[PDB]
Amino acid sequence: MTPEMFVELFREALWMVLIMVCAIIIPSLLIGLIVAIFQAATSINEQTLSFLPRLIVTLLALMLFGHWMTQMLMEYFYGLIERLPQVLY
Amino acid sequence: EYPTSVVLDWIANYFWPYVRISSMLMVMTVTGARFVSPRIRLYLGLAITFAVMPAIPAVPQDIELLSFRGFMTIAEQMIIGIAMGMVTQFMIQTFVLLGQILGMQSSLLLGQLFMFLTTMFFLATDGHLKMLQLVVFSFKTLPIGSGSLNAVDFREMAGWLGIMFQTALSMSLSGIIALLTINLSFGVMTRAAPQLNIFSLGFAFALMVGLLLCWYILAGLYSHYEMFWTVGEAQICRLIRL
Amino acid sequence: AISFDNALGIHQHTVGVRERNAEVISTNIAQANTPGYKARGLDFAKELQAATSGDKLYRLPTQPDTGDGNTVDLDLERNLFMQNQIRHQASLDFLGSKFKNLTKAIKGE
Amino acid sequence: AISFDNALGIHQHTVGVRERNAEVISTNIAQANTPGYKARGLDFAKELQAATDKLYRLPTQPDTGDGNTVDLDLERNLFMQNQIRHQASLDFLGSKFKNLTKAIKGE
Amino acid sequence: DYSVTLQILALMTMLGFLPAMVILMTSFTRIVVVMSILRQAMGLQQTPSNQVIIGIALFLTFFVMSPVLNEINDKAVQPYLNEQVTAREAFDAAQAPMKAFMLKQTRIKDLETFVTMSGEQVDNPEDVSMAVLIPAFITSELKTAFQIGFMLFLPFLIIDLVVASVLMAMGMMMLSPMIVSLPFKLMLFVLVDGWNLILSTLAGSFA
Amino acid sequence: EDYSVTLQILALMTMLGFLPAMVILMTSFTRIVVVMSILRQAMGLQQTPSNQVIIGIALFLTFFVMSPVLNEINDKAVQPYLNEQVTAREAFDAAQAPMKAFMLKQTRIKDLETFVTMSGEQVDNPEDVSMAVLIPAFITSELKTAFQIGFMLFLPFLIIDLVVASVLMAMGMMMLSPMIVSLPFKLMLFVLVDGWNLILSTLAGSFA
Amino acid sequence: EDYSVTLQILALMTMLGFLPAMVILMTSFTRIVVVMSILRQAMGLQQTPSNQVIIGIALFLTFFVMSPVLNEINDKAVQPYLNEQVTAREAFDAAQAPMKAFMLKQTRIKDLETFVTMSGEQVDNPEDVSMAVLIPAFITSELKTAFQIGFMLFLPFLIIDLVVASVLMAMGMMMLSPMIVSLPFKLMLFVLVDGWNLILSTLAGSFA
Amino acid sequence: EDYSVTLQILALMTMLGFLPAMVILMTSFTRIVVVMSILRQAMGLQQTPSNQVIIGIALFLTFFVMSPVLNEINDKAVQPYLNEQVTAREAFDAAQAPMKAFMLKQTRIKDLETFVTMSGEQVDNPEDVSMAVLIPAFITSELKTAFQIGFMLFLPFLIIDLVVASVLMAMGMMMLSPMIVSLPFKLMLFVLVDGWNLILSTLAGSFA
Amino acid sequence: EDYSVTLQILALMTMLGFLPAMVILMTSFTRIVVVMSILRQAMGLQQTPSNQVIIGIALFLTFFVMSPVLNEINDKAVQPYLNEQVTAREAFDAAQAPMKAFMLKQTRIKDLETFVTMSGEQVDNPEDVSMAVLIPAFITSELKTAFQIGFMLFLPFLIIDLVVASVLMAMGMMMLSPMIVSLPFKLMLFVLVDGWNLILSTLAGSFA
Amino acid sequence: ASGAKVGADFNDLLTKAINNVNTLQKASGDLQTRFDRGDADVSLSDVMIARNKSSVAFDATVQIRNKLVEAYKDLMNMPV
Amino acid sequence: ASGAKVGADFNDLLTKAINNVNTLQKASGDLQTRFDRGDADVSLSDVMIARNKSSVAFDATVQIRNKLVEAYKDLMNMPV
Amino acid sequence: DFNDLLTKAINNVNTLQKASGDLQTRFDRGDADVSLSDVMIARNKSSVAFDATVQIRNKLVEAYKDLMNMPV
Amino acid sequence: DFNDLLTKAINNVNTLQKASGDLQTRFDRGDADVSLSDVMIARNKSSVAFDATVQIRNKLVEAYKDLMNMPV
């Protein structure tokens, strides 16, 4: 079709990955700040301390959002497939 | 008549135009892609040459098919075709350059996202049709017999690397400033406590904003492509002296 | 160099002359019994020169005619036709090998 | 099109008629001495129509009491002509397949 | 009409051009390109293999183009075997069903471009010569295959971007995201029943 | 009316020409190659098992799992044909029936439904589809099944890669490549688990 | 009974066609090839020994390690065959026995057990299994044995990489890649230990 | 004496087969690619320009700088040969000489001395040295010359990076990586000075 | 009774078939190629010199260093053969003798010792060993020698890399990558030391 | 215009040619064996005509098969 | 002049040759069946001349066809 | 049973060749109770059987090479 | 040993070729003690041997090329 419609498709896809990455990262970002401020208050200067806490919540987020991210990738594939007629017409 | 003249001329009048057409296809963005088989591309070049044959002027009969002068003719037909093909590769890879500079600045494959979309721009804007129209026009204004790329054409085509960086920087200058100012703002705002630092925490923050800025980049990328195509098309016409 | 003339040589013009000679010889054989018909000869050297870049020769009879006037010696015509066919076969082999060698070099096979 | 009927023409039937004609002439020569036998002639156009008969020959001279109407001078000439034409029909029909095979095989 | 010996030679010669007819006139071109693009979409390079890709396309191009073969059979093959039509008329009677299929599966813009390049004056799209329709058909089918194929590429590119950003979030900058994304790329294709979804749409895409 | 001897020789000499197609489409060779191809990519080694060795083991595996169908062909079609019990067409049909039973056993319904609708023929039972519409449905089913098996085998190696990469980041050495420091452990896991026997056993087991 | 001269030539010319297959499946070529690939991966250089050189050394070594088998083939099979002491049938069987004995000695019971149950044949002792059930088992065991030897060689280079990575991290430079620094020491360890003689001798000695 | 038409064709096809070698060993392709390799490496982009466009620009740059020598070959060798003015043997020599002259203009005296002694031959004039010895000396000089240009191109980008790092450290933010901030500045200063046009002038004109 | 002309041609055509094997195993090509490979990886440039140029330089170098043995073959085995002075069997031996002598000058006695025991032949003098044993011993010695030279050239580049990293860590800019700044100094040292001419001269002088 | 319908139609077209070739070969063989066994009412011309027809028919069958097999190999071995 | 004129001129050359070969084949066929049916105005010499020329003419047609197909088969096996 | 099928076919080809050579040796020795027709029939059967053996072997080897060269 | 086997096989080939060449020269120069059957049997004998050693050499080189052209 028109190049603008392709831009809308690519912006929509990049928007989805932003939602995907935000759901995974933000739980780790919050924990990183919580530990960092706690160290600042307690004058603790271990830079590598706040790695496992970020990893734990990141893995937990993946398990917790397992169903939602699946449902979303599959439906996006179906949405594109049902949008193929736009290309053919 | 002696049948040698009739048969030889058609082979000379077909293969020589085909070589230029085929050489442009193998270097072209879409027809030279790795997805398509050579056989499909070969048939496409054969079909295009047969169809556009009436618009192609008759080649000079002075040059013989079996002679060193005819051998040079085959080589210089390819050079014209590769010249058009490289221009198309220059545009797409510049967008690949645009994708990777944003990705590199995003604390981070993003070139492929731009490469695919730019390929859609090339197909949607009928860029392939224009290139085919350009090569058949090349037969008119740049005849097969007398004519080849001069030294100035080589230097103009060699100067397209500066065109890549200037165009890529122009597209990303607004976004790259945004990426720097937020990262510098994040650095100065969190510099009060050296306990927090950024390291991997800065990696997460930078990449989230970088993806968000790429969403802004795709919002206004089409206008930049239209200006870029005009620059590239003008270069192609300069090569074929149109 | 690298041209069909410089590659084929005189084996392309010779074939045409040999076919021309066979047409002349066959004409004498066919016209052997026609009274008053004079046997026709062909000069190979002159014909080859003309073919490379581009008159009537008659054959002197060995014996007088029996009254008809025909000077065709059918014993000689068969001998010349047999010789012409052999030399024409060699010319085709010579010319045919010119194309095979050219194809062999341009393809390395 | 492209069928054996059209590829072979009528040469597929002529060979058979020349065989039948040769048989009849052979009968006439053998039965030349037997009295009461009437010479039999075959009409070529009849077997032509049969493709797409067995008549009697009227004598040029009277009998001599036998009633046999076979002229051995005529039969020998008619057998010679039929045999020559039979070989030509084989040559015609034989070359029909030789050309047909060369078209299919290309060699 | 041509002699029996010559018209046997004619059909025998074009019997060897059957692969040529398939590639640039029927639906073999679009399916193979879409199959090739999707093969590159997943991390596997030649796991489907070329022969299997071709074998699926050959079966698809027969089912989808089955109406074309039906019309050619009943309009060209049948009259010729009954001696109801001559050699040239039968050959022309076969071009019309195939020229109609190619004409409806191309883009106006491409045909407009090609008639300009061919230098022939034709007032209406449905009267263009086959000499210019064949290159116009494959050029349009290439654009359609690329546009369809790259849209299938997008969901597999989404997975790559998600996993790569997640790995970069933890500072694991050296772990290659492609090997991590490969198991999930395969899962997305099998969960959506990809091998049936693309073929169903590809079959229904033609007219 | 049985075909002439010349045609029958010409008919089965053509089967040898299409023999490679039968192996890659109508047999188990497709799934076994794919699973071992994904298994090779799961481990760090790029092309250590080599293509020829992968094909060699696959050929032995596809021969052992297709023996019952090959034996059924011989004992239903080849032997009556050699003993003049059935004609050529009956022998051809008797040979095809066990082959069709094998493809239909290891196929998916949705894949059969997809292809019967596109072809446009009436179907009421699975055992009525022509071989022209069963071949593309069978290979599609095998590819999905092969991908599912490859996914399972990939997961344990993915876990090792994540563990070893995370541990290096715990000490703070980000520049050290996880791939080099993970290959010995990926190979060792494949050894003490004895992968080359159970994985081939599962591939043989999956077809029956 | 005895095969005709024309058939004997046809069988012999057939085995020359399968000669590459027998090298990578029925000899020591595969294990030596795999080990060098893993050893090359262990060091920092990925294409320095070069594929052609590695295969060339593998071909020379497989000629040295299969010499006892080849000499037995010459003595048992060829010499009675050339002197017309055994038929063509006996010569081929007498040639197969030493080759089968070599493959049986380097195989694993479980691998033999896996394919015997898969082939569905009744086997009482391993020393009489069919050739078609031994070749897949032999190559399976060789691949597993190759991985174990590769893991042994990978550890010393891995230890050097870990040592140099931690030393650089101790001094606070977390941006310098340990791979560049480790490479000279990886090469030296392979030199003063005389690796190209130690590794090849062990590989040759691994079949005794 | 002169080569026959069949033999001249064989020589022509042979040189076409070696055509990639003549570009990368005799022409200016090696210097341009190495210099452009440094430029890509100097900036933060690793593979962003991609290998395809660099070779394509290098090929066009070579055709630009080789145009004087290629035209000199065309006039002196091709034109008499096409017009049948000279034989094939002397025409080949007439084409070889301009290539030899160009390689002498881009080589060093020390490099020639090393290889002429290495070849163990006798010569007194550099103008009549065999092309077999000139080629290794030519590329050796080309690699050294390219490293000189690349080193000069690397300095301004190193200058920018060190300034940015010092500024960030002086401001107290010891936590931010200089590479991300410096990359736009390196790219901006590469564009507003039109860096590639300057590099073209110092690279194309470097041969003369 | 020398080999017939038909067999002599068949032997020579076979030797041309193995020409890549002779160059990559029986000559100096391998050592030069490996040393160039180590040097390229020693610097920051990954594949800037490109593979074709590296092999192109090595091919000319390996031809020059083996010109003496090449001439000795010509003067003792080719010219007597062409002048009808030596049996073709003798000429083949006369050509093989200088090649064997050259390979023995660049081999290590440990390599001969392990391969002689591996072949299991009772030979004492280190001059009458078979080519089957000498070639693997020679290529093994060339690989080990190349590693020693590669380590020698690597050390100065390691010194620069450590100094740059240490200086950057002294200023507290740990975030700055040492590799980007180190590279121009690596190019700097290699060019003012005249590295390209130096290394090729040493590699030429190494074979003695 | 269904896939099964056209598949049957071309199969019917293909099996008709095969049956036609089989008919010519059986007729040729039947004429040969009757003449060879000593039947008086069988002419050598009929025997020779029939066996020439069968040879041409079988030659076309082999040549058509070669075209189809080569065409199949061309499509399968193409570098996709 | 355009390239289509050369292509059309080449096409007319091939069409003219095919018509000439077809004319000879039909001319030979009529003379064969005229002499075979028993017409007395046809000479065996003219019939043999007619079928000699048609056989040579068709053999030339086969040679040109094979070269065209071989060139096309050579053409399709090319890098592109 | 497939092993039996292959060996039985080879044994049939080998048996035909032995019969062909046997009659040729007897005929060439000058045996009176040997007709040239039987010798020609026997050797034509052997030629056809061996031609089948070669072509079947070529087909199987070609099939093997196609599978092994397949990129996995 | 296998090396000596390869050596003997080639020495058999040239012995047949040497014997065939000598018989051809003796017959060609007009010697009356040489029969044409001896020449034809010998020259066909060497032709089969030389064809055999060409085929064996070709198969061995193909095996070498296949082994060396595999990724390691």
Question: What does it look like?
Answer:
The structure is cut from a larger assembly and holds 1 copy of chain A (89 residues), 1 copy of chain B (242 residues), 2 copies of chain C, 5 copies of chain E and 4 copies of chain J. With 89 residues, chain A is mainly α. Chain A is built from 4 helices and no strands. Chain B has 242 residues and is mainly alpha-helical. Chain B contains 9 helices and no strands. In chain B, helix 1 (3-27) crosses helix 2 (38-51), helix 1 (3-27) crosses helix 5 and helix 3 (68-105) runs parallel beside helix 7. Chain B is elongated. In chain C, helix 2 packs across helix 3 and helix 2 (11-30) runs antiparallel to helix 4. Chain C is built from 4 helices and 2 strands, in the order ααβαβα. Chain C has helices at 4-8, 11-30, 44-52, 74-107; strands at 40-41, 57-58. Chain E contains 10 helices and no strands. In chain E, helix 3 packs parallel to helix 8 (130-169) and helix 5 packs antiparallel against helix 6 (87-104). Chain E is mostly helical. The interface between B and H is large, with 53 and 40 residues. Chain D: Keywords: Bacterial flagellum, Cell projection, Cilium, Flagellum. Chain D: It comes from Vibrio alginolyticus. Chain D: It is found in: Bacterial flagellum basal body. Chain D: One of its GO terms (biological process) is bacterial-type flagellum-dependent cell motility. Chain D: The basal body constitutes a major portion of the flagellar organelle and consists of a number of rings mounted on a central rod. Chain E: It is found in: Cell membrane; Bacterial flagellum basal body.
By DSSP (H or I, 4+ residues per run), the number of helices of chain E equals 10
Order of helices and strands of chain B: HHHHHHHHH
**Would you count the extended β strands of chain B for me?**
0
Structural class of chain E: mainly alpha
The helix-strand sequence of chain E is HHHHHHHHHH
Radius of gyration of chain E: 23 Å
- Report the biggest beta sheet of chain B as strand number plus sense, adding barrel if it closes: none
Specify the helix fraction band of chain B: over 70%
List the keywords.
13 chains; A: 89 residues; mainly alpha; 0% strand; B: 242 residues; cell projection (chain C)
Set out the fold topology.
The structure is cut from a larger assembly and holds one copy of chain A (89 residues), one copy of chain B (242 residues), two copies of chain C, five copies of chain E and four copies of chain J.
Chain A: H1 3-42, H2 52-64, H3 66-82, H4 84-88
Helix pairs in contact in A: 1-2
Chain C: H1 4-8, H2 11-30, E1 40-41, H3 44-52, E2 57-58, H4 74-107
Antiparallel strand pairs in C: 1-2
Chain E: H1 4-15, H2 18-25, H3 28-41, H4 50-64, H5 66-81, H6 87-104, H7 108-118, H8 130-169, H9 177-191, H10 194-205
Helix pairs in contact in E: 3-4, 3-8, 5-6, 7-8, 8-9
Task: Please provide a brief summary of the model.
Helix content of chain C is 62%, strand content 4%. Chain C is mainly alpha-helical and 109 residues long.
